[PDB]
């Protein structure tokens, strides 16, 4: 059964999400304007979008129970390697399967696969990304499970460069046992059938999506003209 500490963890994560995710999308007015038609016209606007959510992801991570017990180096390693994946996860909230688009409140801020293309990325990434968004939406996660999966994603002990992998695993285990126990006691069948295994699979899907984005980002960011439209935070987290 769900221990008092486990429902505390869920409460903390639910609150952290509501403080770091804004469903009004009111800050999108501050980004560079979206340009939709050859040129990578969506790169300025999407760079600002990504940079904004990296900030939100950092804010969420800082509130995960136990995260701040890690060294600053480990917190950096965990966030640099996971931010792209948490963005993919948290973007599923705005994703809609009616037209396979990320609807963030307005047509200007409604993104489809054409907009991903107009940021330099190819179907090598977009195709498995949409399949991921579809499959994640299929799980119909409770918000409790949604925030738990984002937090498990962040505190992963196998990320490259992690120093105190013992502590990272112990933190992730408390989150993992919290999620498993939550599914048993609060997710009724048949929705809970193999749910934990399917959620862990999505973490594996994310590692592959991470790999492909990182390789396309490295190719895109190698061109200095493209690097110019990125933000300093994006360049710091995703790489030079």
């Amino acid at each position: 059964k769900l221990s008092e500490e486990q429902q505390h963890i869920i409460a903390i994560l639910l609150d952290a999400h509501h403080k770091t995710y804004d469903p009004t999308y009111a800050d999108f007015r501050d980004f560079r304007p979206p340009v939709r038609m050859s040129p990578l016209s969506m790169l300025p606007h999407l760079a600002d979008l990504v940079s904004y959510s990296i900030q939100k992801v950092i804010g969420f991570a800082k509130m995960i129970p136990g995260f701040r017990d890690l060294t600053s180096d480990d917190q950096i390693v965990l966030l640099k390697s996971s931010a792209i994946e948490v963005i993919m996860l948290r973007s599923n909230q705005s994703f809609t399967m009616d037209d396979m688009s990320w609807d963030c409140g307005s047509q200007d801020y409604k993104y489809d696969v054409t907009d991903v293309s107009k940021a330099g990325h190819t179907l090598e990434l977009i195709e498995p990304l949409i399949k991921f968004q579809v499959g994640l939406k299929k799980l119909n996660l409770h918000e409790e499970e949604h925030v738990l999966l984002m937090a498990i994603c962040i505190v992963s002990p196998d990320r490259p460069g992690v120093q105190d992998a013992k502590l990272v695993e112990a933190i992730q285990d408390r989150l993992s046992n919290t999620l498993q126990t939550y599914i048993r006691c609060r997710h009724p069948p048949p929705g809970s059938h193999q749910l934990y295994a399917k959620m862990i699979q999505k973490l594996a899907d994310l590692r592959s999506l991470n790999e492909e984005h990182s390789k396309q980002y490295r190719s895109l960011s190698f061109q200095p003209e493209n690097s110019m439209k990125l933000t300093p935070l994006v360049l710091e987290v995703f790489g030079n």
Binding site: I58, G59, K80, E236, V237
Partner: peptide, 11 residues
Amino acid sequence: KNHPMLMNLLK
């Protein structure tokens, strides 16, 4: 060190 804006956002 090398991630000053990440470190600053981590307080």
